[PDB]
Design a protein around this ligand. Structure first.
Ligand SMILES: Cc1cc2nc3c(=O)[nH]c(=O)nc-3n(C[C@H](O)[C@H](O)[C@H](O)COP(=O)(O)OP(=O)(O)OC[C@H]3O[C@@H](n4cnc5c(N)ncnc54)[C@H](O)[C@@H]3O)c2cc1C
Ligand SMILES: Cc1cc2nc3c(=O)[nH]c(=O)nc-3n(C[C@H](O)[C@H](O)[C@H](O)COP(=O)(O)OP(=O)(O)OC[C@H]3O[C@@H](n4cnc5c(N)ncnc54)[C@H](O)[C@@H]3O)c2cc1C
Ligand SMILES: [Mg+2]
Lengths: 406, 406
C-alpha cells in the first residue's frame, strides 16, 4: 500500500490529499477542471463544457455562503482575515487554493484530467483518464482509490403528474447561473427544505412573481404547498389551488452519479443511495476503494477533515475494521434507522456529532473543538429562519469552547 | 340543430366550416392564432406564445411539401397558379387563405380566440373561450361541436434508458424552426419511418455529423439502428456502437391532447388513441360532438373534405348512423384489426381508399376522382425512396382518371 489515487480536487479531494501525503503515501489527484476547489469554481458553462466533458460546478453568480466562514474553515487552517463571516464564494475558492498551497498539494494534482474508468486490477486499481489538453488517454495503476467527485452535478427531477404536458421553460438548480433569464417571469421553484430559499431570493429581485412550492421571504415570493400536477402552462398544488407559470425551477437536489465506476468495482449507485459503504466511506466489496463526501447535511469542514483522516488511517492499516459481515450488518441497521427518522440514506444531520466522534476514535484524529458544535447548532438553520438578514451577522471564535457575535 | 362550433381554423376546421355553412348551420369558428391555416403558419415562437397560450404550430423554415400540390388541393378547388408541384409551405398557407375567402368563411371565424373549456349542457354544449386581444373570457352555447384542433403540437418522447443522464441539448421536432442551433454540432436524430428524413436533410447542410437512428441521404448523415441507452454525452445503439453527440433531436411524433375537453364530454384521450370514436369522427357517448383530423397517414385533402362532409351530413340528419351498440362493435373490431396490422389506432394508410368510399356512401359526398388514388399510390412514398431529388418532379392532372409527369 503506497500509491493512492484521489478522484477530484474539490474540498473532499484536497483534504484527502493532505492527509494521505502526510501519512507517507504517493498520492496522485485527478481533477477535470483547470483549477482546484470543486464547485467553488464559477463558470458560465453549464451541462457540458466545450472541452468535451461535463460541467460539474453548480455555482452561480453572486453567491454568499450560508454558514459563517468560521465554521467552513478546518479547525487547524483558519480562514484568511477578511471582514465578515458570510463571505462571497470567491473567498471560499481562495481558501481552498491557499489550503492547497499551504500543504504542498499542488504538485500532486493533474489538472484537466477527466477520470473515465476505474476497475479493480489484481488487488489494486486501474484508473483511466483523459488529459483534456491533448485528448490523450492515460492509464495509471494504484493500490487504492479515494473517490471525491461530488454529488451536486447530476440533477434529480421528482416525477409529477402531467409534467410532460408542461410547455413553459423547465430548468434545474444545476444550470442556474444568474437570475436574468427569470426577469419579469412567473416562476415556480420546486424545493425541498432550504434548497430553494437562496434561489428564490435571488430570483425575487428580477421576476414578476415567485412561487416556492414545498411539501421569511420578500413580498413577491409566495409560498405554496406540494406541487401535484402540471398542465400546459399551469401548476396545481395539494391545496387545490393552481397558478399560471412561465418558468419552473427545480431545486430538488441531485442524484449520485459515478460514471467511471465499472460494475466490477462492486458499488451500486442508486439516486439517493450508494452501497455497500461502511460509514459512508469504505467500499465493503473492494476495501481499497473509499469515498469522501458521499454523506451530506453536516458541518462539512469537520466532515471532510474527519473522513480524510479515517480513509487515511484505514489505508495505512492504523484503523482495523470489523469483518465485512459486521460492516454489512451495521450498514443495514444504520439505513433502517435513516428510514425510521425519515431522512435519505447518507444524511448526517440528526447524528453528525456522534458520527464525528466515532470517526475520531477510529482514525486517531484530534478531537474537534466543541465550539464547532455549539456554533453550528446555533446558526446553521438561520438561512431558513432569517433568510433576508442572517448574513449580516458576523462571528468570532474566542477559544476551543466559545464564540461570540460581533 | 342550428348552432355549430368549430374548434380550430386549420385545414380541418376550414373545411368543416365550408360544408357546415353550406348546409345552412350557424357556424362559429374559434382560432387562437391571428391567421387561418393551422400548422401551415410559420412562427418563430415555440411552446408558449407571449400572448399567454400554447404555440400549436410545428412548422419550420424553408419547408416544402412532401406530396404534390395536385394531391393537396381539394378536387373542386384547384391550387392557384404556381410553378412546380412541390411548393413551399407559404403557398399552402396561401391556398387556405384563398379557400377561406372563396367560400366566404372569414366572417365566421373568431381569430385570437383560445378555447379553454368545452362541456355538455342540457342538450347542447357550453364553450368557454378567451379573447386573447382583451384577455376576456367568453361563453358560447352550441347544439354541436366539431373539434379540429390538430395533433402535431403535444410532443411524444419515447423513454430510453439513461435519458436522464444525458447532458447535451435535447429537443423535439415541435420546436425545430431552423437548422442553425445545430451548426457545427454532432447531432442525433431519433426517428420512426420518414419522421426524421426532412429534418436530417435540413440539419445535414449545417452540422459536423448527423446520425439518424431508427428501429439515400447526404454524405454526413449516418444511419444508426435503435437507440438503446444514453449517457452524459454519448448515445449507445442496439448494434453495440456508441457515438458522442452534442444534440439530440426527437422526431418521434406527437400525442393526442385536447385540454379543453371536460371529462363529461365522454371522450378518453390517450397518447395514440382517442375514444370512443365512430370512424375517427363521432363521439359515440355524445354524438353531437365530432372530430375532424384525428385520423392520419392518408391523402389529407380527401380526408378533410370527406370527414367534413360526413360530419355535416350527421348534423343535418342526412347520414344514417348505426345505433350506438353497433358503433361500439365496429370501433372495437376496427381497433383489433389495427393491432393485427401493427399500426396505431387512427392510422388510415392501409385502408384509406376503402375508408373514403365508406364516408362517401354515408354522407352523399361526390365520388373522389380516381386519379387521386392512382397518383397518391404512385408518389406518396417518394420522400423515402428519393429524398434529395423527389421534389424536382412535377405533375399535372389530365382528367379524373389520369395524370402525367411533366
Ligand atoms: C450552489 C451551492 C452552494 C453551496 N453553498 C455552500 C455553503 O455556503 N457552505 C458550505 O459549507 N457548503 C456549500 N455547498 C456545498 C459544497 O459545495 C460542498 O459541500 C463541497 O464543495 C463538496 O466538495 P467535494 O470535493 O465533495 O465536491 P465538489 O466540490 O463538487 O468537487 C468535486 C470535484 O470532482 C471533480 N470531478 C468530478 N468528476 C470528475 C471526473 N470524472 N474526473 C476528474 N474530476 C472530476 C470536479 O471537477 C470537482 O472539482 C454548496 C454547494 C452548492 C452546489
Ligand atoms: C412539420 C410538418 C410538415 C408537414 N408537411 C405536410 C405536407 O407536406 N403535406 C401534407 O399534406 N401535410 C403535411 N403536414 C400535416 C398538415 O400540417 C396537417 O395534415 C394539417 O395541417 C392538419 O390540419 P388540422 O386543421 O387538422 O390541424 P392544424 O393544421 O394543426 O390546425 C389546428 C388549428 O387549431 C388551432 N387550435 C388548437 N388548439 C386550440 C384552442 N384551444 N383554441 C383555439 N384554437 C386552437 C391551432 O391554432 C391550429 O390553427 C405537415 C405537418 C407538420 C407538423
Ligand atoms: Mg355517392
Amino acid at each position: 500500500m503506497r500509491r493512492v489515487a484521489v478522484l477530484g480536487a474539490g474540498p473532499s479531494g484536497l483534504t484527502a490529499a493532505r492527509y494521505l501525503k502526510q501519512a507517507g503515501f504517493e498520492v496522485m489527484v485527478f481533477e477535470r477542471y483547470h483549477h482546484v476547489g470543486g464547485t467553488w469554481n464559477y463558470t458560465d458553462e453549464t451541462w457540458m463544457s466545450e472541452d468535451g466533458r461535463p460541467v460539474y460546478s453548480s455555482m452561480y453568480q453572486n453567491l454568499f455562503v450560508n454558514l459563517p466562514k468560521e465554521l467552513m474553515a478546518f479547525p487547524d487552517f483558519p480562514f484568511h482575515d477578511i471582514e465578515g463571516s458570510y463571505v462571497p464564494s470567491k473567498e471560499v475558492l481562495k481558501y481552498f487554493d491557499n489550503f492547497t498551497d499551504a500543504f504542498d498539494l499542488r504538485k500532486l494534482i493533474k489538472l484537466q484530467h477527466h477520470v473515465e474508468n476505474v476497475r479493480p486490477c489484481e488487488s489494486g486499481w486501474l484508473v483511466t483518464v483523459t488529459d483534456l489538453t491533448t485528448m490523450v488517454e492515460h492509464s495509471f495503476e494504484f493500490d487504492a482509490v479515494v473517490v471525491c467527485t461530488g454529488q451536486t452535478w447530476c440533477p434529480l427531477y421528482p416525477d409529477v403528474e402531467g409534467r410532460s404536458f408542461f410547455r413553459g421553460r423547465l430548468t434545474h438548480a444545476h444550470e442556474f447561473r444568474s437570475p436574468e433569464p427569470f426577469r419579469n417571469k412567473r416562476v415556480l421553484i420546486v424545493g425541498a427544505g432550504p434548497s430553494g430559499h437562496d434561489m428564490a431570493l435571488h430570483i425575487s429581485y428580477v421576476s414578476k412573481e415567485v412561487f416556492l412550492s414545498r411539501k421569511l421571504f420578500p413580498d413577491n415570493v409566495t409560498e405554496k404547498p406540494l406541487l401535484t400536477s402540471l398542465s400546459e402552462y399551469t401548476a396545481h398544488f395539494s391545496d387545490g389551488t393552481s397558478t399560471d407559470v412561465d418558468e419552473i425551477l427545480y431545486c430538488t437536489g441531485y442524484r449520485y452519479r459515478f460514471p467511471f465506476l465499472s460494475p466490477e468495482c462492486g458499488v451500486t449507485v442508486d439516486e439517493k443511495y450508494v452501497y455497500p459503504l461502511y460509514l459512508h466511506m469504505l467500499n465493503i466489496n473492494k476495501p481499497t476503494m473509499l469515498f469522501i463526501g458521499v454523506s451530506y447535511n453536516a458541518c462539512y469542514s469537520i466532515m471532510f477533515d474527519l473522513q480524510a483522516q479515517w480513509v487515511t488511517a484505514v489505508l495505512a492499516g492504523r484503523c482495523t475494521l470489523p469483518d465485512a459481515e459486521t460492516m454489512r450488518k451495521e450498514e443495514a441497521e444504520y439505513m433502517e434507522k435513516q428510514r425510521a427518522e425519515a431522512v435519505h440514506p447518507h444524511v448526517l444531520m440528526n447524528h453528525q456529532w456522534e458520527y464525528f466522534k466515532k470517526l475520531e476514535e477510529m482514525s486517531g484524529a484530534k478531537t474537534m473543538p466543541p465550539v464547532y458544535m455549539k456554533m453550528f447548532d446555533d446558526v446553521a438553520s438561520d438561512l431558513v429562519k432569517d433568510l433576508q438578514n442572517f448574513r449580516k451577522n458576523n462571528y468570532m471564535i474566542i477559544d476551543n469552547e466559545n464564540y461570540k457575535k460581533i
